[PDB]
């Protein structure tokens, strides 16, 4: 049982369509500033000047990435973003990988992607992380999926959608692209603050199946 995008409101799908086709992309910086316990800030880097927060879901996350220098790859808002200091906050959950977690030769995943069980074009994602955040790759997808099929335009005909991960072992990771957690991107990537991370090599491939 698929979520509707009937379901979602203007605001919800407006957000969603601005989010997954401008991610925050950011490589080899570094924080040394703990904000709230689970939060790690980054001044002057988020876009235009503005300062970034990275929030995860515990102190131990945080914590890990304290003082390293990390990759970023995420969803970013602004809306109900904490306020840092004088200068504009941005956001984003999760998103985080050590910089120095690199593989030896980039990994290029395939994904199957079918609309109305009609096989369409296989989609490419790539990455240079030996440990890849699952937001990212979800990322990547939806990207080519809004690029594409439109899928969080109202009126475009592709109402359900499930995006869905596989390793190489029995394990499998899935999102339904709109099953969004609230209107506001404070809320709908909230999906993503664990930082899950994926071993890049171990991840098979991705299977997209839309419905109109």
Request: charged share 35%; glycine share 6%; hydrophobic share 30%.
């Amino acid at each position: 049982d698929l979520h509707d995008k009937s379901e979602l409101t203007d605001l919800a799908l407006a957000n969603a369509y601005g989010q997954y086709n401008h991610p925050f992309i950011k490589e080899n910086i570094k924080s040394d500033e703990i904000s709230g316990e689970k939060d790690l800030i980054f001044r002057n880097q988020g876009d235009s000047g503005n300062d970034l927060r990275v929030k995860f879901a515990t102190a131990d996350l945080a914590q890990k990435f304290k003082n390293k220098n990390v990759d970023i790859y995420g969803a970013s808002f602004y809306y109900k973003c904490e306020k840092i200091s004088e200068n504009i906050s941005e956001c984003l959950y999760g998103g985080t990988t050590l910089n120095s977690e690199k593989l030896a030769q980039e990994r290029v995943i395939g994904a199957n992607v079918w609309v109305d069980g009609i096989q369409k074009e296989t989609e490419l994602i790539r990455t240079n992380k030996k440990n890849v955040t699952l937001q990212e790759l979800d990322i990547k997808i939806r990207k080519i999926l809004s690029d594409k099929y439109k899928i969080y335009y109202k009126d475009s005909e592709i109402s359900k959608g499930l995006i869905e991960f596989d390793m190489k072992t029995p394990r499998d990771y899935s999102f339904d692209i709109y099953d969004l957690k609230g209107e506001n991107d404070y809320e709908i990537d909230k999906i993503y603050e664990d930082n899950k991370t994926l071993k890049s090599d171990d991840i098979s491939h991705i299977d997209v199946n839309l419905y109109t």
